Amino acid sequence: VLENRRARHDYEILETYEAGIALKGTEVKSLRAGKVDFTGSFARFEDGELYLENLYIAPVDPRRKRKLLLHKHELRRLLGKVEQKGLTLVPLKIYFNERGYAKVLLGLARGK
Ligand SMILES: [K+]
């Protein structure tokens, strides 16, 4: 389990959400090795899809924008809360579930 220690220590975390991550190439192997950097990463909607931006996965652009996969119920919870004054949707942790799906726990963060 890869954790964003900075987010937890410097921000107050409000609601959280879980999503899958669409990985490409060797990205999956790098994540298993724990070669990730959360610095400056955030999630934002673009053309009907939620994307995780600026997440670094050590060696394809190591910081390419990656599509997040949301189930309808989670999308419904999120819609309308992403763009709110002073809040940022940030990745809190990345892990793989039993079936091998890469997952990211997102949280609305407010300046602490
Ligand atoms: K800190």
XYZ file of C-alpha atoms and ligand atoms in Angstrom:
113
model
C 0.000 0.000 0.000
C 1.486 3.297 -1.198
C 0.522 6.295 0.923
C 0.535 10.066 0.464
C 2.074 11.016 3.823
C 2.159 14.717 2.963
C -1.583 14.926 2.286
C -2.400 13.357 5.648
C -0.014 15.573 7.607
C -0.692 18.910 5.901
C -4.361 18.844 4.972
C -7.702 18.120 6.539
C -9.329 15.300 4.601
C -13.083 15.532 4.089
C -15.051 12.995 2.022
C -13.143 10.204 0.286
C -13.811 8.194 -2.859
C -12.373 5.087 -4.466
C -11.612 4.596 -8.121
C -9.748 2.254 -10.413
C -6.744 3.446 -12.424
C -6.204 2.708 -16.129
C -2.509 1.800 -16.386
C -0.378 1.358 -19.504
C 2.920 -0.281 -20.373
C 5.270 -1.049 -17.472
C 3.319 1.140 -15.038
C 1.823 -1.854 -13.231
C 5.276 -3.306 -12.557
C 6.551 0.021 -11.221
C 3.640 0.354 -8.806
C 4.257 -3.133 -7.390
C 7.796 -1.950 -6.709
C 6.387 1.106 -4.958
C 8.078 3.553 -7.323
C 5.510 6.359 -7.131
C 5.550 10.049 -6.135
C 2.352 11.889 -5.105
C 3.841 15.400 -5.105
C 1.521 17.886 -6.785
C -0.928 15.216 -7.909
C -4.665 15.896 -8.136
C -7.773 14.566 -9.863
C -10.053 16.540 -12.178
C -12.834 15.854 -14.692
C -12.212 16.323 -18.413
C -14.703 15.523 -21.164
C -16.822 13.229 -19.003
C -13.932 11.290 -17.477
C -12.076 11.712 -14.186
C -8.300 11.907 -14.598
C -5.468 11.685 -12.102
C -2.923 14.334 -13.035
C 0.766 14.769 -12.238
C 1.240 11.432 -10.492
C 4.803 10.215 -11.058
C 5.342 6.498 -11.673
C 9.029 5.724 -12.200
C 10.052 4.111 -15.517
C 5.908 6.672 -21.753
C 5.562 9.937 -19.840
C 6.193 9.078 -16.158
C 3.732 11.874 -15.349
C 1.107 11.270 -18.017
C -2.529 11.977 -17.194
C -4.273 8.732 -16.229
C -7.950 7.885 -16.494
C -9.707 6.847 -13.297
C -12.546 4.328 -13.373
C -15.646 5.105 -11.323
C -18.685 2.971 -10.637
C -21.932 4.877 -11.139
C -22.615 5.197 -7.414
C -19.220 6.779 -6.737
C -19.552 9.127 -9.711
C -22.890 10.297 -8.278
C -21.246 11.045 -4.917
C -18.427 12.985 -6.565
C -20.246 15.042 -9.202
C -20.490 18.649 -8.096
C -17.985 18.417 -5.242
C -14.722 18.328 -7.210
C -14.796 22.034 -8.083
C -15.342 23.696 -4.705
C -13.674 26.753 -3.183
C -10.439 25.868 -1.396
C -10.724 22.106 -1.890
C -8.561 19.810 -3.994
C -9.263 16.179 -4.868
C -6.002 14.376 -4.148
C -4.716 10.773 -4.181
C -4.321 9.480 -0.616
C -3.209 5.918 -1.265
C -2.754 3.443 -4.107
C -3.111 -0.314 -3.733
C -4.241 -3.435 -5.570
C -7.327 -5.390 -4.547
C -7.560 -9.202 -4.566
C -8.478 -9.366 -8.255
C -5.442 -7.285 -9.159
C -7.235 -4.029 -9.920
C -5.120 -0.949 -9.248
C -7.137 1.326 -6.971
C -6.694 4.867 -5.724
C -8.340 6.340 -2.628
C -9.089 10.017 -3.323
C -9.927 12.651 -0.735
C -11.161 16.228 -0.785
C -8.356 18.112 0.928
C -8.547 21.498 2.599
C -5.647 23.613 3.808
C -4.799 22.733 7.397
K 3.832 17.936 6.576
